[PDB]
Design a protein around this ligand. Structure first.
Ligand SMILES: CC(=O)OCC(=O)Nc1ccc(CC(=O)N2CCN(c3ccc(Cl)nn3)CC2)cc1
Ligand SMILES: CC(=O)OCC(=O)Nc1ccc(CC(=O)N2CCN(c3ccc(Cl)nn3)CC2)cc1
Ligand SMILES: Nc1ncnc2c1ncn2[C@@H]1O[C@H](COP(=O)(O)OP(=O)(O)O)[C@@H](O)[C@H]1O
Ligand SMILES: Nc1ncnc2c1ncn2[C@@H]1O[C@H](COP(=O)(O)OP(=O)(O)O)[C@@H](O)[C@H]1O
Ligand SMILES: [Mg+2]
Ligand SMILES: [Mg+2]
Lengths: 352, 352
């Protein structure tokens, strides 16, 4: 069958698909038409129906997996449209992780003779992350950071070596936030989580601004000024608060200026979008910093799709973790940040 | 002069006023009319102008302070109306703390010959808290907790002994959140803070519901169902997530169901108010829990005015700290929770 790895999250389904490229003359004959048509459909389209997308730029080319050479493909669509995915399948071993592997188990079984193997999300994320870093991003680093994150004239994306990755704090920002401590390839745990995550950004921003997509929310936020909504340290003290090392620009109360009716009447939708993004992103950074201190881990890697096409939040995390930790913690990012669970599930295939 | 302690916060001014009750015959004669009129005005009114309130139920009666017997009074008004307060003063040694002692320093000095003594907010809060607990609340406990916080048929307010208070984690929920670690009467520090505090609750709730006061926001929240807005663990997994001990009712993504347009069209204002309260309160509890673990402190006391007339948030904190800590942390509350800085400032008077 086609080799697939699926992570069914609270918001998106992520799918990794291994396309063989070493198909012999005999294998091509012995392959049934439906399998030929699935392969052509997946490799000859970048958009699938109305909501499916192949992230072509992430493709890993000429990988050797399970004794075959192939290309690894990365595909996403909304969990809301899984019934359409399953219906098209009804007209194969599926390794699946994420909460939806449980919630939608019975739906996958409406595909006759399909074997569903639910795999642990922690195992899948950690194995997928370590695997992609080990094989590299077509010879480039999978892991990167923002150098001189405090100085905008210098701040630039730079590669980071993870060849000895342990220990590692993984902050998975999806609908919510989960925080993992990875001490070895076989010693890792979920530390905690927070409910202020990507779904909070999109849900609040939609209520506050009427935006109808993640990308629209980010474009609004890119034009806004969060200080129109937030109450800063300088608004309370008149300036910096030296005694505790709090700069005047630090947010003392997110949305705290919105207690005043006249300020609510003057704030723009873009300002509210940016305040929502800043609020969620700073809270994630601060929770990550507290967990890193408790776990005694100084490398913090952020994954999930909250950070897809979201350089604002990445740069805010890079600057804030470095600033508030006095340079003791480093924010790290991964090119394949949304897909590690899906890859880890795919890598579970030989165990069945 | 009258003895006053003032904490000028980002949202409210809190004032503690010592009313002497041992005034002799000679002292009553030697007292000037304006001082007699300030004392009568303060003790014969419970509302001052349109926004000032004396919290009569908090009054400490027949306290011995600075060698005199008197009553200690607790008064609050919005920082927005400090210009009215200062203008009425212009028609005394002032010990003042909070960010506004700095921001409004020059305004207080428009009162001729007034000496303003700015005092450190950390010193004032800790000294005020320890003092009020030491003298008691008219013979009753100043400190209380909710017994059997996990079982609603049993959960009830009960007194808690702080006669040996150290160590103590103090979580001051005002406009924002500050977290203090108190190891001794002379060894204490600010641990960190978060910007998701009372101002975030009121500001977001005002944007989302059109409420025009803190009390109205709480009344709305009391009637709402936060699960109409929040995405729960059971919404993602179909049920509990046993592998990590996450119950199905835990919030996986605050406001996370608001990414769906049809759900935004069906949610009520009351539901949004409750989701805002739950979101802010759970984040505060979780940050407090992480800080308590890092500080190795198992008693967490919550202060500030976010919890005034707010039993929902108190009970949510009590239950959540006990549940998520597997009973290792205890949430503690104080009757005078909004006023400790103001008292600590007053207690600084003899140093001048
Ligand atoms: C391994 C992996 O990636 O799996 C996916 C995953 O875990 N998703 C997920 C993300 C976030 C959550 C929320 C959460 O963890 N909690 C626990 C801690 N909470 C509190 C609340 C109050 C207090 Cl006082 N203390 N703690 C809030 C709720 C739940 C599931
Ligand atoms: C002693 C006392 O009661 O004084 C009153 C008082 O302190 N008020 C106050 C309350 C809260 C604040 C906010 C805050 O402290 N921070 C520091 C930590 N932050 C982050 C952000 C990102 C990351 Cl990665 N890490 N940390 C966020 C901003 C500032 C002032
Ligand atoms: N195309 C998108 N649609 C919806 N959310 C997106 C999209 N792209 C990025 N996001 C962001 O990513 C978050 C979901 O990331 P993800 O890691 O896939 O979460 P989950 O595993 O819970 O589905 C959303 O809450 C949103 O903030
Ligand atoms: N009467 C009120 N007016 C405004 N906010 C109130 C009021 N009563 C309680 N609150 C809550 O208390 C918070 C302010 O508490 P407080 O400890 O006095 O903060 P600060 O010291 O920053 O002024 C507000 O953000 C709000 O959530
Ligand atoms: Mg996920
Ligand atoms: Mg305050």
């Amino acid at each position: 069958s086609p080799w697939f790895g699926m992570d069914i999250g609270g918001t998106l389904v992520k799918l990794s698909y291994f396309e063989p490229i070493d198909i012999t003359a005999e294998e091509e004959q012995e392959e049934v038409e439906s399998l030929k048509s699935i392969r052509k459909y997946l490799t000859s389209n970048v958009a699938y129906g109305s909501t499916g997308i192949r992230d072509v730029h992430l493709e890993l080319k000429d990988l050797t997996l399970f004794g075959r050479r192939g290309n690894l493909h990365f595909i996403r669509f909304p969990t809301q449209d899984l019934p359409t995915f399953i219906q098209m399948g009804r007209d194969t071993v599926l390794c699946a992780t994420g909460g939806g592997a449980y919630k939608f188990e019975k739906d996958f079984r409406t595909i006759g003779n399909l074997h569903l193997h639910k795999l642990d999300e922690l195992d899948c994320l950690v194995k997928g992350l370590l695997y992609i870093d080990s094989v590299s991003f077509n010879g480039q680093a999978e892991c990167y950071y923002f150098a001189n994150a405090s100085e905008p004239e210098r701040c630039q994306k730079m590669p980071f070596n993870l060849d000895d990755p342990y220990p590692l704090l993984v902050v998975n920002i999806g609908s919510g936030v989960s925080i993992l401590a990875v001490h070895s390839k076989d010693n890792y745990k979920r530390v905690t989580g927070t409910s202020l995550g990507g779904g909070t950004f999109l849900g609040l921003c939609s209520l506050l601004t009427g935006c109808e997509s993640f990308e629209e929310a980010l474009e609004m936020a890119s034009k806004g000024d969060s200080t129109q909504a937030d109450k800063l340290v300088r608004d309370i003290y008149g300036g910096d608060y030296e005694r505790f090392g709090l700069p005047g620009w630090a947010v003392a109360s997110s949305f705290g200026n919105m207690i005043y009716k006249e300020k609510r009447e003057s704030v723009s939708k873009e300002d509210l979008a940016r305040a929502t993004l800043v609020t969620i992103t700073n809270n994630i950074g601060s929770v990550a910093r507290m967990c890193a201190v408790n776990e005694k881990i100084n490398r913090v890697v952020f994954v999930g799709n909250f950070l897809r096409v979201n350089t604002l939040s990445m740069k805010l995390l890079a600057y804030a973790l470095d600033y508030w930790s006095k340079g003791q913690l480093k924010a790290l990012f991964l090119e394949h940040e949304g897909y590690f669970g899906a890859v880890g599930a795919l890598l579970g295939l030989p165990n069945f």
